[PDB]
Design an enzyme around this catalytic site. Structure first.
Site, PDB file in Angstrom:
ATOM      1  N   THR A 159       0.703  -1.133  -0.061  1.00 30.24           N
ATOM      2  CA  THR A 159      -0.007  -0.048  -0.112  1.00 30.24           C
ATOM      3  C   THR A 159       0.951   1.195   0.085  1.00 30.24           C
ATOM      4  N   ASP A 261      -9.591  -4.307  -0.791  1.00 29.39           N
ATOM      5  CA  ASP A 261      -8.508  -4.979  -0.369  1.00 29.39           C
ATOM      6  C   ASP A 261      -8.881  -5.581   1.083  1.00 29.39           C
ATOM      7  N   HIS A 265      -8.277  -9.559   1.651  1.00 29.87           N
ATOM      8  CA  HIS A 265      -7.462 -10.424   2.617  1.00 29.87           C
ATOM      9  C   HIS A 265      -8.222 -11.475   3.258  1.00 29.87           C
ATOM     10  N   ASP A 308      -3.787   0.777  -5.889  1.00 31.14           N
ATOM     11  CA  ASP A 308      -2.384   0.630  -5.732  1.00 31.14           C
ATOM     12  C   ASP A 308      -1.673  -0.886  -6.075  1.00 31.14           C
ATOM     13  N   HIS A 309      -2.235  -2.023  -5.875  1.00 28.26           N
ATOM     14  CA  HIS A 309      -1.901  -3.356  -6.323  1.00 28.26           C
ATOM     15  C   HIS A 309      -3.094  -4.081  -6.347  1.00 28.26           C
ATOM     16  N   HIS A 420      -0.946  -9.915  -0.804  1.00 34.32           N
ATOM     17  CA  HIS A 420      -0.181  -9.128  -1.963  1.00 34.32           C
ATOM     18  C   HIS A 420       1.326  -8.735  -1.529  1.00 34.32           C
ATOM     19  N   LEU A 689      22.363   3.833 -11.948  1.00 33.09           N
ATOM     20  CA  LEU A 689      23.161   4.644 -12.854  1.00 33.09           C
ATOM     21  C   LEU A 689      24.406   4.108 -13.381  1.00 33.09           C
TER      22      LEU A 689
HETATM   23  C1  LIG Z   1      14.935   8.406  -9.972  1.00 32.11           C
HETATM   24  O1  LIG Z   1      14.736   9.759  -9.693  1.00 32.11           O
HETATM   25  C2  LIG Z   1      15.291  10.147  -8.599  1.00 32.11           C
HETATM   26  C3  LIG Z   1      14.937  11.731  -8.682  1.00 32.11           C
HETATM   27  O2  LIG Z   1      15.439  12.393  -9.581  1.00 32.11           O
HETATM   28  C4  LIG Z   1      16.937  10.026  -8.947  1.00 32.11           C
HETATM   29  O3  LIG Z   1      17.609  10.326  -7.640  1.00 32.11           O
HETATM   30  C5  LIG Z   1      18.320  11.452  -7.605  1.00 32.11           C
HETATM   31  O4  LIG Z   1      19.601  11.378  -8.094  1.00 32.11           O
HETATM   32  C6  LIG Z   1      20.721  12.132  -7.876  1.00 32.11           C
HETATM   33  C7  LIG Z   1      22.097  11.538  -7.964  1.00 32.11           C
HETATM   34  O5  LIG Z   1      21.972  10.073  -7.299  1.00 32.11           O
HETATM   35  C8  LIG Z   1      20.785  12.849  -6.542  1.00 32.11           C
HETATM   36  O6  LIG Z   1      21.413  13.850  -6.266  1.00 32.11           O
HETATM   37  C9  LIG Z   1      22.567  14.063  -5.324  1.00 32.11           C
HETATM   38  O7  LIG Z   1      21.929  14.901  -4.319  1.00 32.11           O
HETATM   39  C10 LIG Z   1      22.336  15.017  -3.192  1.00 32.11           C
HETATM   40  C11 LIG Z   1      21.741  15.847  -2.173  1.00 32.11           C
HETATM   41  O8  LIG Z   1      20.503  15.211  -1.969  1.00 32.11           O
HETATM   42  C12 LIG Z   1      19.675  15.986  -0.987  1.00 32.11           C
HETATM   43  O9  LIG Z   1      18.707  16.919  -2.054  1.00 32.11           O
HETATM   44  C13 LIG Z   1      17.691  16.045  -2.705  1.00 32.11           C
HETATM   45  C14 LIG Z   1      17.171  17.210  -3.764  1.00 32.11           C
HETATM   46  O10 LIG Z   1      16.312  17.920  -3.086  1.00 32.11           O
HETATM   47  C15 LIG Z   1      16.849  15.237  -1.909  1.00 32.11           C
HETATM   48  O11 LIG Z   1      15.696  14.872  -2.669  1.00 32.11           O
HETATM   49  C16 LIG Z   1      17.590  14.352  -1.012  1.00 32.11           C
HETATM   50  O12 LIG Z   1      16.938  13.498  -0.151  1.00 32.11           O
HETATM   51  C17 LIG Z   1      17.340  12.065  -0.070  1.00 32.11           C
HETATM   52  O13 LIG Z   1      18.159  11.796   0.945  1.00 32.11           O
HETATM   53  C18 LIG Z   1      17.055  11.745   2.395  1.00 32.11           C
HETATM   54  C19 LIG Z   1      17.844  10.763   3.433  1.00 32.11           C
HETATM   55  O14 LIG Z   1      19.434  11.302   3.348  1.00 32.11           O
HETATM   56  C20 LIG Z   1      15.723  11.075   2.081  1.00 32.11           C
HETATM   57  O15 LIG Z   1      14.642  11.724   2.755  1.00 32.11           O
HETATM   58  C21 LIG Z   1      15.162  10.998   0.506  1.00 32.11           C
HETATM   59  O16 LIG Z   1      14.437   9.967   0.612  1.00 32.11           O
HETATM   60  C22 LIG Z   1      16.046  11.011  -0.414  1.00 32.11           C
HETATM   61  O17 LIG Z   1      16.885   9.619  -0.075  1.00 32.11           O
HETATM   62  C23 LIG Z   1      17.262   8.855  -1.516  1.00 32.11           C
HETATM   63  O18 LIG Z   1      18.405   9.594  -2.452  1.00 32.11           O
HETATM   64  C24 LIG Z   1      19.605   9.829  -1.940  1.00 32.11           C
HETATM   65  C25 LIG Z   1      20.678  10.324  -3.005  1.00 32.11           C
HETATM   66  O19 LIG Z   1      20.868  11.763  -2.654  1.00 32.11           O
HETATM   67  C26 LIG Z   1      20.053   8.021  -1.584  1.00 32.11           C
HETATM   68  O20 LIG Z   1      21.410   8.146  -0.781  1.00 32.11           O
HETATM   69  C27 LIG Z   1      19.023   7.483  -0.679  1.00 32.11           C
HETATM   70  O21 LIG Z   1      19.589   6.056  -0.604  1.00 32.11           O
HETATM   71  C28 LIG Z   1      17.732   7.525  -1.309  1.00 32.11           C
HETATM   72  O22 LIG Z   1      17.534   6.633  -2.419  1.00 32.11           O
HETATM   73  C29 LIG Z   1      18.661  14.882  -0.352  1.00 32.11           C
HETATM   74  O23 LIG Z   1      18.343  15.554   0.914  1.00 32.11           O
HETATM   75  C30 LIG Z   1      23.948  15.225  -3.202  1.00 32.11           C
HETATM   76  O24 LIG Z   1      24.775  15.285  -2.007  1.00 32.11           O
HETATM   77  C31 LIG Z   1      24.774  14.542  -4.257  1.00 32.11           C
HETATM   78  O25 LIG Z   1      25.920  15.141  -4.416  1.00 32.11           O
HETATM   79  C32 LIG Z   1      27.247  14.131  -4.399  1.00 32.11           C
HETATM   80  O26 LIG Z   1      27.498  13.709  -5.593  1.00 32.11           O
HETATM   81  C33 LIG Z   1      28.002  14.647  -6.779  1.00 32.11           C
HETATM   82  C34 LIG Z   1      27.901  14.333  -8.165  1.00 32.11           C
HETATM   83  O27 LIG Z   1      27.540  15.390  -9.022  1.00 32.11           O
HETATM   84  C35 LIG Z   1      29.221  15.258  -6.259  1.00 32.11           C
HETATM   85  O28 LIG Z   1      29.385  16.454  -7.276  1.00 32.11           O
HETATM   86  C36 LIG Z   1      29.181  15.967  -4.722  1.00 32.11           C
HETATM   87  O29 LIG Z   1      30.788  15.943  -4.421  1.00 32.11           O
HETATM   88  C37 LIG Z   1      28.489  15.177  -3.785  1.00 32.11           C
HETATM   89  O30 LIG Z   1      29.411  14.174  -3.266  1.00 32.11           O
HETATM   90  C38 LIG Z   1      29.605  14.669  -1.836  1.00 32.11           C
HETATM   91  O31 LIG Z   1      28.763  13.586  -0.869  1.00 32.11           O
HETATM   92  C39 LIG Z   1      29.173  12.002  -0.810  1.00 32.11           C
HETATM   93  C40 LIG Z   1      28.306  11.225  -0.346  1.00 32.11           C
HETATM   94  O32 LIG Z   1      28.330  11.858   1.012  1.00 32.11           O
HETATM   95  C41 LIG Z   1      30.762  11.972  -0.969  1.00 32.11           C
HETATM   96  O33 LIG Z   1      31.013  10.589  -1.215  1.00 32.11           O
HETATM   97  C42 LIG Z   1      31.700  12.939  -1.932  1.00 32.11           C
HETATM   98  O34 LIG Z   1      32.849  12.704  -1.710  1.00 32.11           O
HETATM   99  C43 LIG Z   1      31.033  14.413  -1.592  1.00 32.11           C
HETATM  100  O35 LIG Z   1      31.558  14.849  -0.349  1.00 32.11           O
HETATM  101  C44 LIG Z   1      24.121  14.215  -5.361  1.00 32.11           C
HETATM  102  O36 LIG Z   1      24.152  15.273  -6.420  1.00 32.11           O
HETATM  103  C45 LIG Z   1      19.281  13.267  -6.024  1.00 32.11           C
HETATM  104  O37 LIG Z   1      19.370  13.628  -4.501  1.00 32.11           O
HETATM  105  C46 LIG Z   1      18.221  12.134  -6.139  1.00 32.11           C
HETATM  106  N1  LIG Z   1      17.059  12.460  -5.897  1.00 32.11           N
HETATM  107  C47 LIG Z   1      16.245  11.641  -5.038  1.00 32.11           C
HETATM  108  C48 LIG Z   1      14.862  12.165  -4.759  1.00 32.11           C
HETATM  109  O38 LIG Z   1      16.436  10.327  -4.610  1.00 32.11           O
HETATM  110  C49 LIG Z   1      17.220   8.872  -9.191  1.00 32.11           C
HETATM  111  O39 LIG Z   1      18.574   8.588  -9.600  1.00 32.11           O
HETATM  112  C50 LIG Z   1      16.260   8.061 -10.273  1.00 32.11           C
HETATM  113  N2  LIG Z   1      16.655   6.540 -10.363  1.00 32.11           N
HETATM  114  C51 LIG Z   1      16.802   6.069 -11.695  1.00 32.11           C
HETATM  115  C52 LIG Z   1      17.086   4.548 -11.696  1.00 32.11           C
HETATM  116  O40 LIG Z   1      17.047   6.630 -12.714  1.00 32.11           O
HETATM  117  C1  LIG Z   2      -2.321  10.010  -4.668  1.00 25.01           C
HETATM  118  C2  LIG Z   2      -1.905   8.847  -3.327  1.00 25.01           C
HETATM  119  C3  LIG Z   2      -2.552   9.636  -2.194  1.00 25.01           C
HETATM  120  O1  LIG Z   2      -1.517   9.195  -1.102  1.00 25.01           O
HETATM  121  C4  LIG Z   2      -2.149   8.519  -0.351  1.00 25.01           C
HETATM  122  N1  LIG Z   2      -3.336   8.410  -0.150  1.00 25.01           N
HETATM  123  C5  LIG Z   2      -3.963   7.592   0.913  1.00 25.01           C
HETATM  124  C6  LIG Z   2      -3.178   7.000   1.801  1.00 25.01           C
HETATM  125  C7  LIG Z   2      -3.774   6.318   2.965  1.00 25.01           C
HETATM  126  C8  LIG Z   2      -3.173   4.941   3.118  1.00 25.01           C
HETATM  127  C9  LIG Z   2      -3.762   4.147   4.092  1.00 25.01           C
HETATM  128  C10 LIG Z   2      -4.944   4.306   4.940  1.00 25.01           C
HETATM  129  C11 LIG Z   2      -5.647   3.477   5.906  1.00 25.01           C
HETATM  130  O2  LIG Z   2      -6.567   3.799   6.238  1.00 25.01           O
HETATM  131  N2  LIG Z   2      -4.971   2.101   6.053  1.00 25.01           N
HETATM  132  C12 LIG Z   2      -5.653   1.335   6.873  1.00 25.01           C
HETATM  133  C13 LIG Z   2      -5.482   5.745   4.623  1.00 25.01           C
HETATM  134  C14 LIG Z   2      -5.010   6.536   3.635  1.00 25.01           C
HETATM  135  N3  LIG Z   2      -5.664   7.800   3.549  1.00 25.01           N
HETATM  136  O3  LIG Z   2      -6.702   7.826   3.718  1.00 25.01           O
HETATM  137  O4  LIG Z   2      -5.056   8.876   2.899  1.00 25.01           O
HETATM  138  C15 LIG Z   2      -1.650   7.160   1.768  1.00 25.01           C
HETATM  139  C16 LIG Z   2      -1.150   7.934   0.661  1.00 25.01           C
HETATM  140  C17 LIG Z   2       0.235   8.126   0.644  1.00 25.01           C
HETATM  141 CA   LIG Z   3      -3.175  -1.646  -0.114  1.00 23.84          CA
HETATM  142 CA   LIG Z   4      25.931   2.952 -10.552  1.00 23.01          CA
HETATM  143 ZN   LIG Z   5      -3.714  -5.293   1.602  1.00 26.12          ZN
END
Ligand SMILES: *[C@@H]1O[C@H](CO)[C@@H](O[C@@H]2O[C@H](CO)[C@@H](O[C@@H]3O[C@H](CO[C@H]4O[C@H](CO)[C@@H](O)[C@H](O[C@H]5O[C@H](CO)[C@@H](O)[C@H](O)[C@@H]5O[C@H]5O[C@H](CO)[C@@H](O)[C@H](O)[C@@H]5O)[C@@H]4O)[C@@H](O)[C@H](O[C@H]4O[C@H](CO)[C@@H](O)[C@H](O)[C@@H]4O[C@H]4O[C@H](CO)[C@@H](O)[C@H](O)[C@@H]4O)[C@@H]3O)[C@H](O)[C@H]2NC(C)=O)[C@H](O)[C@H]1NC(C)=O
Ligand SMILES: CCCOc1ncc(-c2ccc(C(=O)NC)cc2[N+](=O)[O-])cc1C
Ligand SMILES: [Ca+2]
Ligand SMILES: [Ca+2]
Ligand SMILES: [Zn+2]
Ligand SMILES: [Cl-]
Ligand SMILES: [K+]
Ligand code: NA
Length: 805
Positions: A159, A261, A265, A308-309, A420, A689
């Site tokens: 979900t 759903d 179940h 969703d699924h 699921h 990547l």
């Molecule tokens: C699917 O689409 C998504 C979205 O477009 C793609 O992911 C993007 O890819 C980019 C490249 O990987 C990445 O860019 C990086 O940004 C870093 C800063 O990140 C912050 O800001 C973003 C943007 O607002 C934000 O979304 C981030 O949030 C992540 O992190 C928190 C937890 O920490 C979570 O709340 C959140 O869910 C999200 O996590 C996910 O993404 C991160 C990747 O950042 C993963 O680590 C997690 O596992 C998870 O999947 C952040 O708050 C920035 O720091 C990076 O810069 C480094 O690399 C560059 C290369 O240009 C270099 O120049 C710099 O030096 C720098 O390196 C420095 O730090 C390194 C590590 O500490 C270190 O080794 C070095 O020595 C340096 O000091 C980078 O530019 C972008 O963030 C993500 N976005 C998202 C949303 O994930 C994805 O690739 C697509 N997938 C496919 C298959 O195509």
């Molecule tokens: C475009 C998608 C909107 O994104 C979402 N939409 C609904 C939920 C959601 C999930 C579980 C339950 C629940 O009752 N489980 C027992 C209720 C809600 N709810 O009511 O929102 C979560 C998300 C992220």
């Molecule tokens: Ca569900």
């Molecule tokens: Ca790679």
């Molecule tokens: Zn279910």
């Protein structure tokens, strides 16, 4: 602390959230135990039910009633949804003939068509055909609007992962919600369906639609509903918000339903007890559409009907127990169910070893109903590895089965007949999409697509600019009447070199031999023109791929094939060739078995060498263009060029050789010729990547020849198979794979048998989208076709699933 002494007088379902410890009246207040004292009384009225009756018509306004049948209700925006049917002789929306909506017909003041997302949990794709007799409203939406036979969820098919993917356009590995249940090693915290921690904002990454809208000046209704708010109340609330003044009225809304759903179940996906839940959902849809029609908004609003699924049959007796495989079962924690996730129970135990755990779970029982994987070895199409919250060890469980730790976990917790969460290619997991409204098309079927794609469209529907996501923007333009986003091809960053003959044989000291020392004016002009590109139009059907990063490479031409050779990685990035229906498989002659030839266009310093392969006891080598399919004995020599060579484990060579020798020819016959593009992939950090040079963890011993983690192929032909691949006039047809490059065949339990018993099965499991291959190589395919770019975008996102009908 909540000081629950304030009031909800004129605050019912307030859009902005007020700050603690003041009391709240938002549709999420019940879930936080923070509603004002009078919330139930003022905001959750139920007096007199949900429908107008003949005797309520034109009544005196009684503020206690849940909805109203008084004369002033239309102005107040608070009638029951059937008011005009009962009291004004109007007809239900479902009973009206459907008329095309060529333009939005909105009330004055509306800056844009609003969007309503109607989410239904566990709505299996087949319910559309199988339940059509009991869902007239939904079935009218489907057949008058735009629809797909099914929509593919993301893995794990749960979900929250899926609903948040809808909201963001991201894979769970990128948005963070990688399961219904999670542990985060960095926070030292846990995430459960029950409880408080699931509300903390640090779990939720990316940028969801409601935030995307707010930042760009589009107002959003609050998407979530507390579980105790009845469905009829949710509909009336959305309808109330739609009556608000232009300056306060939201432009996007969301409804969620726990059904079907919740019932699935208990009863299984097709339990006879499932007909009622499907009826209630349809009645709810009818109420929404009747409400929109009352407000003159039924030809103005875009409605998305989405699941969703799906749901599969699962029972207690079909559970595998890890205690029947492992001795150390108490040193481990397992996230159980339709997927397995294993980690150590305690980080202070230095004896726990993932290596021996995998081994102990591998091909142990002849009928085994799960398969262990290191997360980096999971099929790349699942995109399930690059997050610290996904455990190193994963169990892909067979459809219809469960995995648990000990048998006590199952009986001290039969309750369920459905579940699921399985692999997202599994038929029973597919869900639905219907789009209906002025921006959607009329009476149109579109092909199946993936839910990661919707975020972009919802943004298009709202005039918004999407945050960076994993959709491919423009790949779903064929869904839309207008508001289409018009994308351009990415620019090529690196231009190739075209080297001629530049080196003498004797400059190469590679430690390679070939029996190629046997000896005409007619046939020497002929081979020259081949090496300039006289057959290139034959083997490069859709243009050469574009290199979208900074690198140094060469285009190499040959009679049978064309390649883009990387001077940095010392192998081709891609090799392209066409095998027509009539072409014939030959053997590798005895004198050429160990033949590797210097390529006089490429310097010794940018070539591999045979000595490295001799000295490496683990690694052997293979060829991208297969010598088996050479067009003539003379052309065959080209296939032994050191620039056609790539590193291969002997265990992988069994796979590759069977694919090249048997399967390529098979597909050419079945499909009327195929174009093939093959290449290496490097993803040591498993982010999906392309790795740069400094990311490579393994080279061929004592050399700078890097070892691929995967090998891809892209197989293209004509959708109308009456036209041969090389002379196609219409749409194209594609299938692709990304085979993991592994030193053993432990993944295939039948690998000691003949290759015809297991190889094609492995390829199918590792099926892929061309777009997956693009992320992993930094290449852009299909640059020169006669087809529209949007249509190519759709092609690139296609996945061949090998699931039956
Ligand atoms: C699917 O689409 C998504 C979205 O477009 C793609 O992911 C993007 O890819 C980019 C490249 O990987 C990445 O860019 C990086 O940004 C870093 C800063 O990140 C912050 O800001 C973003 C943007 O607002 C934000 O979304 C981030 O949030 C992540 O992190 C928190 C937890 O920490 C979570 O709340 C959140 O869910 C999200 O996590 C996910 O993404 C991160 C990747 O950042 C993963 O680590 C997690 O596992 C998870 O999947 C952040 O708050 C920035 O720091 C990076 O810069 C480094 O690399 C560059 C290369 O240009 C270099 O120049 C710099 O030096 C720098 O390196 C420095 O730090 C390194 C590590 O500490 C270190 O080794 C070095 O020595 C340096 O000091 C980078 O530019 C972008 O963030 C993500 N976005 C998202 C949303 O994930 C994805 O690739 C697509 N997938 C496919 C298959 O195509
Ligand atoms: C475009 C998608 C909107 O994104 C979402 N939409 C609904 C939920 C959601 C999930 C579980 C339950 C629940 O009752 N489980 C027992 C209720 C809600 N709810 O009511 O929102 C979560 C998300 C992220
Ligand atoms: Ca569900
Ligand atoms: Ca790679
Ligand atoms: Zn279910
Ligand atoms: Cl889970
Ligand atoms: K070797
Ligand atoms: Na095996």
């Amino acid at each position: 602390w909540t000081a629950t002494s304030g009031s909800c007088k004129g605050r019912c379902f307030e859009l902005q959230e007020v700050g603690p410890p003041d009391c709240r009246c938002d549709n999420l207040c019940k879930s936080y135990s923070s509603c004002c004292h009078d919330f139930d009384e003022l905001c959750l009225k139920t007096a007199r039910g949900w429908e107008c009756t003949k005797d309520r018509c034109g009544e005196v306004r009684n503020e206690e009633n849940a909805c109203h049948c008084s004369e002033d209700c239309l102005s107040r925006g608070d009638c029951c949804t059937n008011y005009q049917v009962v009291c004004k002789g109007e007809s239900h929306w479902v009973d009206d003939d459907c008329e095309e909506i060529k333009v939005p017909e909105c009330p004055a003041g509306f800056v844009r068509p609003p969007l309503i997302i109607f989410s239904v949990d566990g709505f299996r794709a087949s319910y559309m055909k199988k339940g059509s007799k009991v869902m007239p409203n939904i079935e009218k939406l489907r057949s008058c609007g735009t629809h797909a036979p099914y929509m593919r969820p993301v893995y794990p098919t749960k979900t929250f992962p899926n609903l948040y993917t809808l909201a963001t356009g991201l894979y769970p590995e990128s948005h963070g919600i990688v399961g219904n249940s999670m542990y985060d090693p960095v926070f030292d915290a846990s995430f459960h369906l029950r409880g408080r921690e699931k509300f903390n904002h640090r779990w939720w990454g990316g940028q969801p639609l409601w935030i995307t809208a707010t930042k760009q000046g589009v107002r959003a209704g609050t998407f979530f509903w507390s579980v105790s708010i009845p469905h009829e109340r949710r509909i009336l609330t959305i309808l109330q918000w739609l009556s608000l003044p232009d300056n306060e009225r939201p432009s996007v809304y969301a409804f969620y339903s726990e059904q079907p759903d919740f019932s699935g179940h208990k009863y299984g996906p097709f339990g006879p007890e499932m007909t009622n839940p499907l009826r209630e959902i349809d009645k709810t849809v009818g109420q929404l559409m009747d409400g929109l029609k009352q407000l003159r908004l039924h030809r103005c609003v875009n409605v998305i009907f989405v699941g969703d699924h799906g749901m599969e049959d699962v029972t207690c007796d079909r559970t595998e127990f890890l205690s029947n495989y492992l001795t150390n079962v108490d040193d481990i924690t397992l996230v159980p169910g339709t997927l397995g996730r294993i980690r150590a129970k305690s980080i202070n135990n230095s004896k726990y070893d993932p290596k021996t755990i995998i081994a102990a779970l591998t091909c142990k029982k002849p009928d085994q109903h799960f398969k262990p994987y290191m997360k980096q070895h999971l099929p790349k199409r699942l995109h399930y590895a690059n997050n610290r919250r996904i455990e190193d060890i994963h169990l892909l469980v067979d459809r219809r089965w469960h995995v648990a730790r000990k048998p006590l976990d199952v009986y001290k917790k039969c309750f369920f007949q459905g579940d699921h969460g399985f692999d997202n290619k599994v038929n029973s997991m597919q869900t639905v999409f219907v789009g209906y409204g002025p921006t959607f098309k009329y009476r149109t079927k579109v092909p199946p697509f993936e839910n990661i794609e919707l975020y972009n469209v919802m943004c298009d529907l709202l005039g918004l600019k999407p945050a960076p996501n994993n959709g491919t923007h423009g790949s779903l333009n064929h869904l839309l009447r207008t508001n289409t986003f018009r994308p351009t091809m990415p620019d090529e960053v690196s231009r190739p070199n075209y080297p001629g003959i530049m080196y003498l044989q004797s400059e190469f000291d590679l430690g390679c031999t070939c029996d190629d020392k046997v000896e005409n004016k007619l046939e020497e002009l002929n081979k020259r023109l081949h090496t300039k590109g006289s057959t290139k139009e034959r083997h490069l059907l859709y243009g050469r791929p574009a290199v979208l990063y900074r690198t140094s490479y060469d285009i190499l031409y040959h009679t049978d094939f064309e390649s883009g050779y990387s001077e940095i990685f010392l192998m081709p990035l891609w090799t392209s060739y066409t095998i027509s229906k009539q072409a014939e498989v030959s053997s590798i002659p005895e004198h050429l078995t160990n033949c590797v030839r210097p390529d006089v266009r490429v310097s010794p310093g940018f070539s591999q060498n045979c000595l490295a392969y001799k000295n490496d006891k683990q690694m052997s080598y293979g060829f991208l263009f297969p010598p088996y399919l050479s067009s003539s004995p003379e052309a065959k020599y080209d296939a032994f060029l050191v620039t056609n060579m790539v590193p291969m484990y002997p265990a992988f060579k069994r796979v590759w050789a069977y694919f090249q020798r048997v399967l390529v020819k098979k597909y050419a016959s079945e499909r009327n010729g195929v174009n093939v593009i093959s290449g290496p992939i490097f993803d040591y950090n498993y982010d999906g990547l392309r790795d740069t040079e400094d990311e490579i963890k393994q080279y061929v011993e004592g050399s700078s020849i890097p070892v691929p983690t995967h090998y891809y192929s892209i197989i293209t032909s004509c959708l109308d198979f009456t036209q041969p691949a090389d002379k196609c006039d219409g749409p194209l047809s594609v299938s692709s794979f990304i085979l993991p490059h592994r030193p053993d065949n432990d993944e295939s339990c039948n690998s000691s048998e003949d290759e015809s018993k297991w190889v094609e099965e492995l390829m199918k499991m590792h099926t892929a989208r061309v777009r997956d291959i693009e992320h992993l190589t930094g290449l852009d395919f299909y640059r020169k076709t006669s087809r529209s770019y949007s249509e190519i975008l759709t092609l690139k996102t296609y996945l061949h699933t090998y699931e039956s009908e």
